[PDB]
Amino acid sequence: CRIPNQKCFQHLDDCCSRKCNRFNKCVLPETGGG
Numbered sequence: 001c002r003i004p005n006q007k008c009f010q011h012l013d014d015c016c017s018r019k020c021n022r023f024n025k026c027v028l029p030e031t032g033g034g
Contacts, residue, residue, distance in 0.1 A: 001034050 001016030004026035008015055015026035 003033060004028055 002014055004015035004017035004019055006014055006026050008020045008024060008026045017026060017029035019027050019029050021027045
C-alpha cells in the first residue's frame, strides 16, 4: 500500500500502516509494503 516511510502527523493520513516510530516517521509493518 502507500509506503510507510514518510512523515506521519495526527491529521496526516498517508501511510497505510500508520506505524510510526520515535522520529515520527512511518515504518514498515509486518504485512509489508502493499
